[PDB]
Nucleic acid binder design. Structure first.
Ligand code: K
Ligand code: MG
Ligand code: MG
Ligand code: MG
Ligand code: MG
Ligand code: MG
Ligand code: MG
Lengths: 86, 93, 63, 118, 273
RNA sequence: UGAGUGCAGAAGAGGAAAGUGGAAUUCCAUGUGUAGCGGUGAAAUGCGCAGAGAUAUGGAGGAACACCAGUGGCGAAGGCGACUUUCUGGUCUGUAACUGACGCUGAUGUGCGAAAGCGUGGGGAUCAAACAGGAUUAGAUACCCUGGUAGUCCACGCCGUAAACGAUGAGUGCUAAGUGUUAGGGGGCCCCUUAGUGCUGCAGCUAACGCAUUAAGCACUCCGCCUGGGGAGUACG
């Protein structure tokens, strides 16, 4: 993707203004990334080197998401209903 | 996305249709959601190796700014058909 | 010895400057090696790209 | 029977078991050749410098009857026949206007054959 | 691509068939249909001249433009239909003057897509040009061999030809079957492969599925009697018993060329096979 | 502080689809021109007076991309080498805004995996299992030679192996130096430092060989694996 869309989405999920490193922000970015890579793969389905990075992104997402579930279920539930990933 | 298009026109075209051809191709690269930062012409220069029993040919650079790639694709497509053209290369810069 | 591009400050090689490239070539159109020219690897790799492009466009010979 | 061509090419193909030396126009038309097999050489003699000289001499003397003085040299292949063949061509009463050691070297092309184990 | 039916019975055990997914309308255009009665190898004389035809589903002929004489006008593909009269799928193209005609639909022709014709045309698939304004190497179909008559050399499914060069008034064409042929440059053609590219991968599965098409069964010669077939006769199964395998009417069939040799295309044909 | 994000930068044969190009081989057609060519330890089979081979021109077609090219680079490995466009992943440096241990390993499972091989459908130049011939030899269903089918090539599936090797599991940290190189950064051509990549080498280790800041050292965590050779990576399941 690009800095443009990246900024455009982290603005609306960051808990505050200078934050750009919260789990919510990261996992939103990640969902954008994996969706992009999937739309690449539905055309170029034989790029396993790119599916690999997809899998890494998914694992990192789920790790953040388990941590947030441990920390505040309310932010967890709210984020997942805002993203539609469960 | 600033590209750079250079092609080759066979020496045995008369100057009028040569000007017309170059108007066509500049209008193609420009008239698909683009613009042309510059449209340049060197001259009937020598070739290092022969094409189709041609020995020398024209050069024409068309430095383009664009996005979405459609113009450049149609350039390649039509330059394939056009036997008035010999070479074409695009280089993103 | 010395690198020509580092010497001259130029940092980006163009596929059209035969009066800059033709001295990095043998008699037979062959790319010269780096121990000969004294170039860096970055600029040598640039030379490969630029030269082979110029050859495609007939600005220089394969032979 | 008569032909008057003043300048031409000599194509020296040499290998590790035979050399052939043919004498043409500047347009690829044959006037004469020679070969160690034409001279009767059989075996490790065809490989030699000697048969190379003798073939160049024979073909040049076949071709000067067509009135040839100058001739361009065109070498192909490996083998220790080419230098001797060329010196012999100087001795055959012909002038030498250019050597070209052009040899078909590919750009990483067709797959060569397997290795001989003897 | 292809439907592989599961093996319930033994008739669907090795069957395949087509998804029919290139196809948008089934109901045809009433205005362009014509009747088509079966003849079944039966000549004017009433006699069965050609064997292994007859006894199939009935059909109605979809009238098609293999000429494309309507030039300059641009068309709009409306629907891609079925034709039983052929192996390929067809397209209802609507000219801007409001006329509907069928064509052989190529590979990659989509609904809403435009189709021109003439010499001043684009080189896109579905468009019809003469072999002068068709450049070299391009892949084509529906070539006519006589200007004005209509396309006869690329009409089946998945078929195409290749333009190679020009001998002035003639044009070299690398047919399917590998046979090169000069063709006259006024003659039209279309760019692309004909569609239904998987028509050949259809396992029929049954004898009925062939009888529905109009294919009576082939009886072989080694089972007929000597009154009927020269391979025939013999006590037990017998082999052929001749230097050459023969046809029913007593001509050899394996290897023997059957072509006339003082024909006018013999000079137009550069390479064979 | 570790691990991750962001901001500013760098390199790269990382991967996938299409597109373009040139050298060479093979094949064809035409011209010239005639006695062999090719190959061998040496010869013959084979091609050739139906005009070969050489040579020149042109064309068709398929495959691989000379020089750059490097103990160089990238990738989890396998592997990746013409050029271009489109799409796409990961890594390194600096900063110190940002979250604040979110980390490591990882059985079962899932998925990627040279080459050969298999299925379907194309393609088909070279090379070349099998096959045929010649030769060699006591014999030669081998080496060598002439040819030559599958196959090698493409797409979609399958197999799921290798001396798949660094025969060295992954993560983290501490432990003398020296010298080359790759991509960076800071300072004043030199110095210093990150992440890799090679060589030599002290302590230590090792049965020895040798490893030695890219440990085979010192230690911790997790996983898998060994317990004499053969039978046997066989058999039954
Ligand atoms: K390996
Ligand atoms: Mg009977
Ligand atoms: Mg009879
Ligand atoms: Mg019997
Ligand atoms: Mg009988
Ligand atoms: Mg062999
Ligand atoms: Mg180091």
């Amino acid at each position: 993707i690009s800095q443009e869309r990246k900024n455009e989405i982290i603005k609306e999920y960051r808990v505050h203004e200078t934050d750009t490193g919260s789990p919510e922000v990261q996992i939103a970015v990640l969902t954008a990334e994996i969706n992009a890579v999937n739309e690449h793969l539905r055309t170029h389905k034989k790029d396993h080197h790119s599916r690999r990075g997809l899998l890494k992104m998914v694992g990192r997402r789920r790790h953040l998401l388990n941590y947030l579930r441990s920390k505040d279920i309310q932010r967890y539930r709210e984020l997942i209903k805002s993203l539609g990933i469960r | 996305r600033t590209y750079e298009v250079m092609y080759i026109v066979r020496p045995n075209i008369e100057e009028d249709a040569k000007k017309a051809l170059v108007e066509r191709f500049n209008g193609i690269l420009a008239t698909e959601g683009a613009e042309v930062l510059e449209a340049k012409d060197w001259g009937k220069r020598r070739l290092a190796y022969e094409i189709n029993d041609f020995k020398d040919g024209f050069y024409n650079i068309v430095r383009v700014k664009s996005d979405n790639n459609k113009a450049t694709d149609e350039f390649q497509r039509l330059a394939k058909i056009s036997d008035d053209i010999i070479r074409y290369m695009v280089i993103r810069e | 010895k010395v690198c020509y591009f580092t010497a001259n400050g130029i940092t980006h090689i163009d596929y059209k400057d035969t009066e800059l490239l033709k001295r990095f070539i043998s008699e037979r159109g062959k790319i010269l090696p780096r121990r000969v020219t004294g170039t860096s690897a970055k600029y040598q790799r640039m030379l490969t790209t630029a030269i082979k492009r110029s050859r495609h466009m007939a600005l220089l010979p394969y032979v | 029977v008569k032909k008057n061509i003043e300048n031409g090419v000599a194509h020296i193909r040499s290998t590790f078991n035979n050399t052939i030396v043919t004498i043409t126009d500047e347009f690829g038309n044959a006037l004469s050749w020679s070969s160690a097999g034409a001279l009767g050489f059989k075996g490790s003699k065809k490989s030699t410098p000697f048969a190379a000289q003798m073939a160049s001499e024979t073909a040049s003397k076949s071709a000067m009857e067509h009135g040839l003085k100058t001739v361009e040299v065109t070498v192909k292949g490996p083998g220790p026949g080419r230098e001797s063949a060329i010196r012999a061509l100087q001795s055959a009463g012909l002038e030498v206007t250019a050597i070209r050691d052009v040899t078909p070297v590919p750009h990483n092309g067709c797959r060569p054959p397997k290795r001989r184990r003897v | 691509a292809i439907k592989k039916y599961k093996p319930i019975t033994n008739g669907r055990r090795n069957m395949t068939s087509l998804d029919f997914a290139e196809i948008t309308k089934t109901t045809p255009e009433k205005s362009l249909l014509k009747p088509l009665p079966k003849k079944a190898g039966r000549n004017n004389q009433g006699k069965l001249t050609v064997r292994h035809h007859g006894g199939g589903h009935k059909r109605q002929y979809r009238v098609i433009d293999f000429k494309r004489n309507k030039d300059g006008i641009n068309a709009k593909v409306d629907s891609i239909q079925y034709d039983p009269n052929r192996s390929a799928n067809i397209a209802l193209v609507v000219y801007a003057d409001g006329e509907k005609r069928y064509i052989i639909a190529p590979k990659g022709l989509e609904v809403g897509q435009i189709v021109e014709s003439g010499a001043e045309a684009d080189i896109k698939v579905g468009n019809a040009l003469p072999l002068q304004n068709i450049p070299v190497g391009t892949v084509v179909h529906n070539i006519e061999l006589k200007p004005g008559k209509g396309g006869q050399i690329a009409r089946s499914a998945g078929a195409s030809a290749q333009v190679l060069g020009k001998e002035g008034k003639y044009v070299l064409i690398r047919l399917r079957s590998g046979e090169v042929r000069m063709i006259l440059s006024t003659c039209r053609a279309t760019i692309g492969q004909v569609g239904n590219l998987q028509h050949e991968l259809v396992n029929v599965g049954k004898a009925g599925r062939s009888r529905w098409k109009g294919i009576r069964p082939t009886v072989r010669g080694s089972v007929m009697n000597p009154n009927d077939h020269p391979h025939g006769g013999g006590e037990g199964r017998a082999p052929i018993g001749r230097p050459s395998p023969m046809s029913p009417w007593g001509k050899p069939t394996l290897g023997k060329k059957t072509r006339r040799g003082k024909k006018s295309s013999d000079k137009l044909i550069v390479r064979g096979r």
